[PDB]
Write a protein that binds this ligand. Structure first.
Ligand SMILES: Nc1ncnc2c1ncn2[C@@H]1O[C@H](COP(=O)(O)OP(=O)(O)O)[C@@H](O)[C@H]1O
Ligand SMILES: Nc1ncnc2c1ncn2[C@@H]1O[C@H](COP(=O)(O)OP(=O)(O)O)[C@@H](O)[C@H]1O
Lengths: 302, 65, 302, 65
């Protein structure tokens, strides 16, 4: 009664509506984020999807080779996957031209920025009269993007014992709502979930361990880890020191998280860009990659 | 019997575990290493709970004659 | 009139007293931190050294295979390099059993923790009557360890326009001193400097770029970048897709930082632990690694 | 002539540069890409300086009859 080493369960799911993808270091968060989308978009034609990114470097545009902006466009070559690239930090900075009690309260700026995103989304579903059944978040590379989930509990730990010198204590109780309505959702293992990307090296396994903890505290559902850029060097056409170490950690991770969906991806020769390759690579999130038989498909990519 | 036998058992246990974790390769035994850590992170809070359990029972007897 | 691609200039220097080593991701900060020490310790026998680490996972002890604690021990096999492993976060947490105005002011906790370190050092030079001419910092893996350098300027931007309800505004002016006495030093390109470790992949080059900026703001001297874990795959005894990309970035970095000491280290087969290997590997910080001639020395390591 | 021709020239230039940076592979042209960025980070402040240069000259004429 072991757990399947892949995301099929997730890509098959019909219940989820929110899926978060993240991991520090250049380990392939973006690549994975796109992969989960396409895979989710191909396995359920009826549903309409949205892959969104907060990163300012416009990575999803780099990943697909297309120019996606603030307007929810559809991937060229797809039918139910739409990408949206937005910068909240800038947006929230214009309707702020004070926030003094924001820097004061850890977690405000985030919640704010987030809601600034949701807005830009419901706005897209209006001018487009198109409802998104599931959204995928390409979590910001640095910073705790979604820390606001604690905002509720913390805003209570400073109200019973703490204080228009009060119009502040109002539009604040009004927030500890928007956030708890949300947190309640993301804290539902059936509606939302988080997938952690990671490379199989020490410092990376640490970080992702940290993160997993961070999500645990927030009461977010962490269930899957995709270990990217693996070698499996021994299954090449012919003769490796790194694979020895990676393998080392892989065994450790399998032992640490026995109830987790640990996915092992291969390190292809060169970039994995554009729908044709992304799709080709992504399928290894569904049916686990087999170094033997699938050794070739990893050389079709450029 | 609580704010003592507890605040020690643990702080002690923690202290005991802490030195042990520092006797294993966080690298060759990442498995165990991180397990222990996760644990210490737990004790680290229930000890910080008994630190308020023991402090609420003070602001209690003095706020109530 | 180009710049030497190595640290010889630094390892030769007699003026410096403080050298900071850091970089996120598992790129070898620790390995580099140890390497700069040993190299500095061997090239100047007269001087006495100290390699210190804040990391709780006790990494320097892992790197050398020895058990270094809070007491400045000497490396077994060395003569002027001493390692000291301390956890400030814990220390500063005992003489705090409020800090309310710490979380309030960004940069306090750090300065505090730092000074808590310096103390533990001058304390070692007393009970040991042994003065350290130069110290090397194995900067904490996550968090802006040394952000306090802004503490001065910020404490001024909230005094002329802001307020024992005042014994606070005193032991605070007393700090904006300890910190500025220090900042003045670290901001002296002759006494202190920072070396950034980085792997030659995108996400890592970004981060280190970020960091470099962060240090620039603090007015700290950033002059050297050591790009670790390189392949140079074409100089192996016999036939590589990653080296193609790495090489790609390497060219970019050389172009971005023309006045910087960009050091290229090799990726050896397996761990680089213990004095015998560390020393062997470290020499490539002084005389740059040549893939051709030095191709062997990278296989003597385990 | 300052709090206008300046606050625009730049905000404009910045705005102009911003769109350009979004026309190059942060990956194949990391070199240029990061250069531009470093620049924008500069304009990002002198614009935030003219935002206080223009605001100190207001709290000035009104604090001085
Ligand atoms: N499994 C893999 N094998 C080979 N190359 C990969 C793999 N995953 C990602 N890449 C490369 O890394 C780049 C994407 O890195 P990225 O995912 O953006 O790092 P991050 O997720 O931290 O932003 C792509 O250009 C691609 O060439
Ligand atoms: N140039 C290199 N070639 C091969 N292995 C290396 C190299 N540098 C570091 N390592 C390996 O990485 C480990 C140290 O990683 P580490 O330096 O602690 O990452 P970090 O600096 O982020 O903490 C060692 O166990 C060693 O085996």
């Amino acid at each position: 009664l072991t757990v399947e080493p892949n995301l099929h369960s997730l890509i098959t799911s019909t219940t989820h509506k929110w899926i978060f993808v993240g991991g520090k270091g250049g380990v392939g968060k973006t690549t994975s984020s796109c992969s989960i989308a396409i895979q989710m978009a191909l396995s359920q034609p009826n549903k309409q999807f949205l892959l969104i990114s907060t990163d300012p470097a416009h990575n999803l545009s780099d990943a697909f080779g297309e120019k996606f902006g603030k307007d929810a466009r559809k991937v060229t070559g797809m039918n139910n996957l739409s990408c949206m690239e937005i910068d909240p930090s800038a947006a929230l900075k214009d309707m702020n031209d004070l926030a003094d009690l924001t820097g004061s309260i850890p977690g405000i700026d985030e919640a704010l920025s987030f809601m600034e995103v949701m807005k830009h989304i419901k706005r897209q579903e209006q001018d487009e009269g198109e409802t998104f059944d599931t959204v995928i978040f390409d979590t910001a590379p640095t910073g705790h993007t979604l820390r606001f989930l604690q905002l509720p509990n913390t805003l209570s730990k400073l109200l019973e014992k703490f204080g228009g010198n009060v119009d502040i204590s109002g539009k604040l109780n009004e927030l500890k709502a928007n956030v708890e309505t949300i947190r309640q959702q993301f804290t539902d293992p059936d509606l939302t979930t988080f997938v952690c990307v990671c490379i199989s090296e020490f410092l990376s396994l640490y970080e992702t361990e940290r993160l997993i903890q961070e999500l645990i505290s927030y009461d977010m559902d962490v269930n899957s880890i995709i270990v990217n850029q693996l070698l499996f060097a021994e299954n090449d056409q012919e003769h490796q020191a790194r694979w020895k170490m990676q393998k080392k950690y892989l065994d450790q991770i399998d032992e640490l998280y026995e109830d987790f969906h640990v996915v092992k991806m291969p390190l292809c020769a060169g970039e994995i860009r554009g729908l044709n390759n992304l799709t080709k690579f992504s399928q290894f999130l569904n049916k686990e990659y087999n170094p033997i038989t699938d050794g070739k498909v990893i050389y079709e990519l450029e | 019997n609580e704010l003592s036998k507890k605040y020690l058992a643990k702080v002690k246990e923690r202290h005991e575990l802490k030195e042990f974790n520092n006797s294993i390769s966080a690298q060759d035994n990442y498995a165990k290493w991180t397990k222990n850590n996760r644990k210490l992170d737990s004790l680290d809070k229930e000890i910080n709970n008994l630190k308020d359990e023991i402090q609420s029972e003070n602001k209690a007897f003095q706020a109530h004659l």
